[model samples]
Target: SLLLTNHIGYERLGPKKAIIQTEQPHLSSYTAQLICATSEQTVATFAVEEQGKVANWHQGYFYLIDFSSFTDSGDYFLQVEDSRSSTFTVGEHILLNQTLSDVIHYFKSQRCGGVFDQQDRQVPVLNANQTADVHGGWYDASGDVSKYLSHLSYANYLNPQQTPMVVWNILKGLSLLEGSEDIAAFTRTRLIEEALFGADFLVRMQNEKGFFYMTVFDKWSKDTAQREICAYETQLGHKFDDYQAGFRQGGGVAIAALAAASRLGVHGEYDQQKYRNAAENGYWHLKEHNTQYLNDGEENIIDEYCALLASVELFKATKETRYLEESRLWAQRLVARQMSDEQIQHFWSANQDGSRPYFHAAEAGLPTIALCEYLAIEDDSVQTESVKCIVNRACEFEIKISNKVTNPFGYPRQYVKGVNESKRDAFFVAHNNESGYWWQGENARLGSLATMAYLAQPHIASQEIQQQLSVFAQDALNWIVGLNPYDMCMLDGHGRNNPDYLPQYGFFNAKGGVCNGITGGFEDEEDIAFNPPAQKDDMLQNWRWGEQWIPHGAWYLLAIMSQAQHISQLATSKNI
Candidate 1:
């Protein structure tokens, strides 16, 4: 059957001025349109833009007509020449459908059969549950691997907010599979590699003043110098030499890096000292320069979220709940800025007309996750309720926005509102055309992280978090397994993702070795030809390599590992 492309329009017949009763006399001249639809024998009609209307339509047609003070509640159809043209019903509509399967096919294929004996790589061949724990590879050779990697890498630096959180959650997921030896080994290896890269990168990028530059390369100056040059003149009339010279490591970045390191057990005298110093310095910096709100005087959800996270990390690592308390203070401060009235809580900054609500799914999700994490550790009923309130509210917001429409980009949009006007229209502008893909998974990640955090609290055992953690962990594992498998991909697997063509996936061949896509971690570059950065990237501007590995994907891996350790400890203890 062919679907016909038909224009659906509606018209209501009545006195427009008398019916609408608006202050503007012009509005009274035209009768407002009403929605009309039919399902089987049921027909319905209602005002299209009514204030108390229950339904919303997209890309349809309608008309407004008045029929003598009609307050009737009966089905009506606009019949043209004895044919029912447009039909309408006056009440609610119900839709129901079901599918039945008499016979089910459960055929599974093994992509890397030779690499491991069982389906689950996590299971050791000699383990007792090896046979029962088998699983299959998630990724198939469907799309252009090179293209996919390119998109993935670009997404790392371009849209760090959405993608990095996914990478972090995936890392946390590796911990969930600790019961499986092979998977655990894999997780540890990846975690260490990513963590080292992330930590070392953060240190290398730290400015003397202490704030981290966003990415590795001076992405802002690529076209300006006509060559990639890190040195540029600041608005202060002074020429900042390179990433190492230009910006300082901000409190948010330092604390996040420090927390990841502390949890992963990658501490050394130098690393610990650096982390301590950064934490101390960053605390002072934020305390002095803290802004009440961000986004050009609007609500600054990202900054606030980062601050909360940083505070938790400092508190956790230092054995000082003061940092945790500080984080709570910020959370309290942030609550005032939330969009609480319109069915969901969104983070908003002030617009000309007071405060205009903006929803960055990451911002909303992270804070909720952080609060839950805090409450999990503390086991305070009041705090737990607060976290639940945030989580539920944010989830409500997510549901409301996600259900309405997909953004301009083929992916779901992270922020409900488009990017602010003052931003640069650079390589990473929210095209609104490409749909954003990382929000739901991000929410899952934050939720999982919060669960793990709560599970870590003293004198508390949460069965709900454990169950949810298992499910989320499985999802995270499956997602990564689908993306990178042991047999098909190489450690330097950024390029040559597909058989057909060569394209850049964040990683590059640096001085004959392969560097990761995100943080520029050097692996074996001898097999490939490349060039080293003549100068370093500004940590504040370009902290991680302008690739996918840095703070985006790699940090996530470490965060997951931290949670894994927490779970492992929890599993060891039998007491509730």
Candidate 2:
């Protein structure tokens, strides 16, 4: 709890802070010296900035060492009096370069049903005569082996983009790395093949009726009889025979990923035309039957924004005017969802009337992310201006709420409107988020918001705000790698101390898998906690901290590649 930093390293132009915490009796008089690991010399010194007892970080007294002014590239360690820290890197793209490969490894470990047996070729539909050849998608999480396009059906707005999000992000990463001037060609190849594997799984999940199957549950038993298509809510071991896939429940982004793959390359056995055809087919079916696919037979902000995703990607793939029209239509709906109240600003409202404020544990940034994607596709000045304005407001409001309270780590705080529909700032997902039994480390949520921050920087007019957006994006990933209370790197195999083995499900933690991450206390909701151990015999509570989930890895991949490209662009300009 004393010495902390982003163990994965920092970009040269990026902000860097290595913290020292004590009883105020230990190193109160000592200045922190950044010592070069190679030469064993103190190259930079920083004065301490006191952040005493930050509300969200409950660990101890704090001393901040701001070495961001140092632009030297080296491997270095921090020394404050007697306690010296582990070495960390500072270079052009150390954050991405150091950690990206292992995250790819995690995805490869999670690949499921690629080599099918009897059950894999033709899976049963629960309580129905029909059988599905529903094969190939990453397992949803550690300790669970089910494949879901998306789930948490009852939670409505907070559903994680479980399978397709991974597919979409890997594919996106593949394209992003293709333009890299210096990244190894091997990294790009890995991403491309992985994207194809995931896309193939996604096509398999689509039904002949056109709506995607929401989940393929095996109930953690290999009994092929137990495996069946069902709509699921995760209170642990609760599911229904409802197999309908609404837009938010994975059908919408399902269309989005397929269309994106259509333009990218062949998606497994599917040619580009088949990917395009699948996207178009899914889009038309949802336009007609989306309501029937929902648990409540209703649509909320999740639907509106993800509908935007589907429309935009389909338009990009097909060059169809109707898809473009629908993209703009969905963008306008998303703009309506943003809170216009002077105090709340651009964060979304869950309902049309604006009384219900929007917050999501998993996809918290999707509202702004959706609009930013829309901004990319729109060519007209008027539409472009409107979308950019929304993104600016949204990023501005996000920065404000994140700093509303004392947050030393810069981990983003959300403006949550509870189920009772009251508004307040929360550092962690609310215990009352209506997911009932489910809430976990929001590393994925941080990744999503980080991408939101990076996407908004170009549209922001003020230099100060642009800097804030940059810091926000970096801090989100930094928290995952190490910059927090526990000094535990959530990314496996890349840090001095990662979270414990995920033995609860008879599996050791996989390299590159990001754990659920820090959470609020089990008993006290006000205080933050990161349960670093999985005491296998105890209650199943540690999964909230130690477990690895797909969205966490997927969104982190997106965040890393986004920041890497940004830094690469900046360095290239200066060098040229």
Candidate 3:
């Protein structure tokens, strides 16, 4: 079997790794060759290290090749025996010139506010005769023309950051790359434009009551009038149509994103004043009424982390004592979620009192991330020390669990619990858990974990652990870029064996959009499934491994930007 060497290609100075499979496990004198793009001759050859058997994936041997030392600006392929990989670049600015540019295009194409778009101007509230003019925001995904601040709230623990996350990541990515001289002028311009576009929608989505509408679901229909202000569980009837957003259900990150925008500048529909005011209003309202807005009626780690992010951003924006107080409130809860029991492996619990280890479809690393953000604003020595301790321990637990097994990709795996089961560990998310009908590949999960490693490294004390975390982060990204079983690049339109874009389904036809990548099996949760063969128009066709979720693209951009920043710092220190 063959695999992509580096599907979207690797940065010249960054870590480069690839997996090769062969039928003979005990073969001797086997080697992997890096082929030149210009000719048939091999440019570099490396000894193969067998990764051996990996779970129940296949009855074959997998080998690893590390060409990280090779620093050349050229297109090349990996060759082992008669098999050859798709052409990939080992060069500088490969990401900016290729992937990042396309992902920026994706954000632009996903716009839904303005006239002649989704025509959401006079959008109706579900089952209400009145309309509140909830417009603007990117469509939820391909095959779904709805807009959501958050979804899967009914699942309680797995709610995604959704639209607001995209805004935050847009701003986050802009901040990371704007200083790079290599980045084009128009890229920065479009990033600001995109951030403003999303911020405008967030501003409009907020009501006088201080809550944002959770969603504007269109019921998968083409009729513009079919769209209505709604929530995910409202599909049952009109009685279930409570669209008020909650802290975990998109309200928190919406505030966080807006507050972040307030500290920045843009010349679009609204300025920093509008963002600050909306964020403050939303924060106070949620602080007063978050319990009533919870779809599950119980505050968990998700709520705490999101509120922490919101408060941290507000404090940064306004420098208010109240915001800092609120941040500590949520930070304490997030800290409380870390398990004290060594057997529990110091992983975060889903709830403060504890039930299962925290695992999320999106923003999985958010709790630690929020706490670290809080530390920056806090002057208290004791709290800062305590915060760093937990954050470091959490990172240590992840690195330990991932290395416990013989993972060739240095992939990060989370602690998970399945339905009717106690706490356990396995990769690729549990199939029989919450969001019953909506489990898919976890590209967003990988991105967030990678970002976590990058951000947490500076806070860590052990230099060895820090270096390991870097490899862990890089390899986590390697999986997303296409080194997995299917050799399929989840980032749309930018790699080898890209998933089919079904026009019949409302697939987002953008180059840089990312799909739900490889998922665990239905019957066997540990087994991987990528683009499984199915009947025509199969329901899972797009949802399982092809739908371009906004969160995926958002996380991808953020993680890659973090990786870039790390590389840029490296080059500076080495005077490269």
Candidate 4:
């Protein structure tokens, strides 16, 4: 019994390569059989090749078998020597649906304002100055502390697309679950309830003046007992009584959430008119005064990105041509902000001349996402060609980066023209650069945008191009799941083999939390600088470079959902 496979299992539509470990290196050339669990029939058999060795708990001579061609829907298990892997399923809809549910559950488990007796984490209402309770919503990250409206709003916007396909999928999945009676009705109800939790917080943040509060945090204390919570205004110096004044980033996010809520019809216990009215006011405020809010040390293009999302959502909510016009205006603004370099033509963090390409999921793919939304709305006079051109250009940048600069595992080499070549080279050389981890998630975000583009303008693209786009999306997602060089599932608890080490936080105590990014290899201090140590021990010591964030989880879920939707469309078309 020298063979070992994934602890959890495999997905039917997912990457079919299984990492089989063997204690005996001589067995690297062994042939393995994947037999149907029920029928005990040999579905597929393949020779395993040596995939090198690692130094960890399951460290051994690893062999990989690509069963990607096994398209049959059934229960199966792989066997090598006397060892049989876990029984897994191969089906069109399997892992992703459950993965999506687990991600949403992670968010729910991270909910603040009340005590979860199971998790043993509790916090009281501490917003003393404010008359309102700024209590409900998810914790920003692993520590179960702090809440950034900007991040929450981005999550909200990405959660519900202008097209309700993903939301429909969620609802449909819920219906199926209810019909099966596998899970309790209250469990299903809790999913949607938890989703609307953020909406409630967003609504509460929106004042009559239309400006939403930027952040809610007291201190960064690991101990929940000592932590105090308080709401804070935007970094741009706008307060509660600022009349109709609004902070750009936070306000735009609020509008995006409201617009999404209006479309998705997640009225819950809130007034629908109130959501629309607040969105209108916030949109107008951002339309009049487009100011950028500073978060951490850097000035972000989040306001612009969020504005595009908000405008598109608003346009969908109200068939108003004005919102469409605003969307176009925001699209153009984003186009102007795109890096003009022939080598790197993606969007940047700020509107400065020759700004380095911004690589975060929320910032990087937003322009393309926004343009795709604009193109989906068929308007002859909307300068459709120009919008298409921008979309193609953005996609081209992504395609080029994917082909030229990405690692074999399909992670992007987050480099730009204006950024220092030395830093770029350092990232490649070190492999363990913190920026690498930060930039890797952008691929999933960009892949999602590419999928959206194909979906929006499938007729506009060639068959080859569409297929390539889908591959790009699938590969990006595959890397996150388990198909990377490290053979590690970046997600904490979803797969058979996930990251063993995570930040010491409440969410990590369970599973389903995705790590910030994965590193290539450990490098020198000069080369790695901000990058955390690539090894497990070092990561355990300093997890800031790898702590789970709400934005990353939200982006991954959105990307996977978009990929799933695209695959469903392809299957439908093929049958037709």
Count residue pairs with overlapping backbones in model 2: 1
Q: Please write out the lDDT profile of model 1 over residues 40-121, one tens digit for every residue.
A: 3333232312221111212122222233244344444432111232233222110000000000000011011343323222
lDDT values of the candidates? 0.32, 0.79, 0.79, 0.52
Reference-based lDDT, residue 293, model 1? 13
Q: On a 0 to 1 TM-score scale, where does candidate 3 land against the true structure? A: 0.94
Candidate number achieving the greatest TM-score relative to the actual structure: 2
Residue-level lDDT of model 3, residues 1-576, one tens digit each, is 674566877889877888876677765556888889888678999877878876656536788888888898788998877577888888765665678878888888877744424367787777767777666678878767788898777778778889999988878777767678656788788878888888989998997889998888766665677677887652232324768889999999999999988887554588899899999999999889998988668888888988998999999999999999998888887888988554456888887555677888678877767887888899877767878889989988888878776678776777888778877766767766766665777888888888888777767889888878778877878788788877777787877667755666544456788877877765676665765555125664446777778888888888887777777766777974
RMSD of each: 18.9, 2.2, 2.4, 7.2
| TM-score winner, 1 or 2 | 2
Q: Residue 23 lDDT in model 3?
A: 74
- Cα-lDDT of candidate 1: 0.32
Candidate 3: segments with Cα more than 4 A from true spot: 39-41, 113-118, 234-239, 340-343, 380-382, 505-508, 534-537, 540-542
Candidate 4 lDDT over 1-576, as tens digits, reads 334333334445545655565466666347889999998989789877665544222334557676767777777888877577667667664545557678777767666644422122233334434334455666666743665554222211121121122222233234324344334566567655654566666676655555665554435454545333333332221223221213333566567666666654446557667667778887786665544323332323455556776787788778899988888777777667666555554534343565434544433455566566667664785577766766666665555665652133333444432224432311222323223222223323433453444344453455656555554555556656655434455667765455432434334533666665553234432222223434445533344434565655666665655555555655667777
User: Ten consecutive residues with minimal summed lDDT in candidate 3?
Assistant: 232-241
Of the two candidates 2 and 4, the one with more favorable TM-score, higher being better, is: 2
lDDT per residue as tens, model 2, 115-220: 3334766877767888888767777777667788778877776766778888777776666566666468788778878888878877888888887888888776
Which run of 10 residues does model 4 get worst, by summed lDDT? Answer: 155-164
Sort the candidates on TM-score, descending order. 2, 3, 4, 1
**Candidate 3: C-alpha lDDT:** 0.79
Per-candidate TM-score against the hidden true structure: 0.45, 0.95, 0.94, 0.72
